[PDB]
Amino acid sequence: TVVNGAKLTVTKNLDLVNSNALIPNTDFTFKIEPDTTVNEDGNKFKGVALNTPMTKVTYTNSDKGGSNTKTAEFDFSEVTFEKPGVYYYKVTEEKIDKVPGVSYDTTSYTVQVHVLWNEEQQKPVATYIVGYKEGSKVPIQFKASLDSTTLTVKKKVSGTGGDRSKDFNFGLTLKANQYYKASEKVMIEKTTKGGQAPVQTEASIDQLYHFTLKDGESIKVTNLPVGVDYVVTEDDYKSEKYTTNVEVSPQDGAVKNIAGNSTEQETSTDKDMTITFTNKKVF
Q: Are residues 183 and 102 in the same domain?
A: no
Q: Are residues 247 and 133 in the same domain?
A: no
Q: Are residues 141 and 163 in the same domain?
A: no
Give CA angle at 202 (256, 190), nearest 5°.
60
Rounded distance between C-alpha atoms, residue 119 and residue 70, angstroms: 35
Resolution (angstroms) stands at 2.2
Identify the domain boundary among 98, 130, 147: 147
Q: What is the dihedral angle through the alpha carbons of 191, 196, 197, 199, rounded to the nearest 10 degrees? A: -60
Q: Are residues 164 and 269 in the same domain?
A: yes
Domain that holds residue 114: 5-147
Q: Are 216 and 192 in contact (CB under 8 A)?
A: no
Q: Are residues 117 and 230 in the same domain?
A: no
The CATH number of residue 206's host domain is 2.60.40.1140
The pairing of strands 7-16 and 140-146 is parallel
Q: Are residues 99 and 14 in the same domain?
A: yes
Q: Are residues 88 and 175 in the same domain?
A: no
Rounded distance between C-alpha atoms, residue 215 and residue 165, angstroms: 7
Q: Are residues 112 and 154 in the same domain?
A: no
**Domain count along the chain:** 2
Identify the domain boundary among 147, 176, 199: 147
The pairing of strands 199-204 and 185-191 is antiparallel
Identify the domain boundary among 147, 179, 204: 147
The pairing of strands 148-158 and 273-280 is parallel
Q: Are residues 168 and 108 in the same domain?
A: no
The CATH number of residue 22's host domain is 2.60.40.3050
Q: Which helix (H) or strand (E) holds 90?
A: strand 85-94
Asked whether the CA dihedral 251, 252, 254, 255 is positive or negative, the reply is positive
DSSP 94-135: E-SSPPTTB-----EEEEEEEEEEETTTTEEEEEEEEEESSS
Rounded distance between C-alpha atoms, residue 193 and residue 144, angstroms: 39
Rounded distance between C-alpha atoms, residue 185 and residue 48, angstroms: 47
Q: Are residues 9 and 139 in the same domain?
A: yes
Q: Are residues 128 and 207 in the same domain?
A: no
Q: Are residues 16 and 109 in the same domain?
A: yes
